Design a protein around this ligand. Structure first.
Ligand SMILES: [Zn+2]
Ligand SMILES: [Zn+2]
Lengths: 130, 130
């Protein structure tokens, strides 16, 4: 077998929208009605593997499609090496339909000392500055 | 009270990175070590409320920061009216640290008839074409 998204673009069937750099598909296994995908034509496993040229216009295309589809409530999700099934970057756009039909996150947030946060901020500045 | 992200940008403290249109903060209540936020300076509740000018460079800035931070495994998440606490668009970048320290999604996917999928694709084409 080879990459499903490269294969689907090559086959050229069921593509709902296309730009110079991107194409869109309705998800065959949706979390919610209207769940679609915005996908760069170029193939790399992770977002940081792309040059800017290969990723041109993702958020614009998402905006364009949610407007055409009439979606007001939705989540954008992109997965790098966590919950990633397919190793070709793709952006999920997942409409909120109802409580049992939507993106479902278990948001277990940790709290930090102010000083653990001051440290975290300083460390981030060090990384940015390197 | 008024918008936390507008307030935090105005106060100008703890900003880790900035571009003409965006700024970044380390999340004060992280899902995982290094969880940060890329935030447009301009204020609207939802992604589709922004013009392209106000959203310029989000994915580039995310790429830039994950590279500076050395993150290889991470999720990008943006919430419009589902699991949204703050009504000013912000992109979560959430590193995968371990199984109990990462973005946790309950991925309950539905299956469809080929013909329910052919219908879904046709309906999407109709919406795009309108
Ligand atoms: Zn591919
Ligand atoms: Zn704001």
């Amino acid at each position: 077998e080879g990459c499903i998204f490269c294969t689907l673009y090559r086959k050229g069937a069921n593509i709902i929208y296309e730009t110079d750099r991107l194409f869109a598909l309705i998800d065959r296994y949706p979390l919610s009605k209207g769940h679609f995908l915005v996908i760069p034509k170029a193939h790399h496993p992770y977002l940081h593997n792309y040059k800017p040229e290969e990723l041109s216009g993702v958020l614009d295309t998402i905006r364009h499609l949610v407007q055409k589809f009439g979606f007001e409530r939705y989540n954008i999700l992109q997965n790098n090496g966590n919950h990633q099934e397919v190793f070709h970057v793709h952006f999920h756009v997942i409409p909120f339909v109802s409580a049992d039909e939507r993106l479902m996150i278990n948001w277990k947030a940790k709290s930090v000392s102010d000083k653990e946060y001051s440290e975290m901020v300083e460390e981030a500045r060090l990384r940015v500055s390197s």
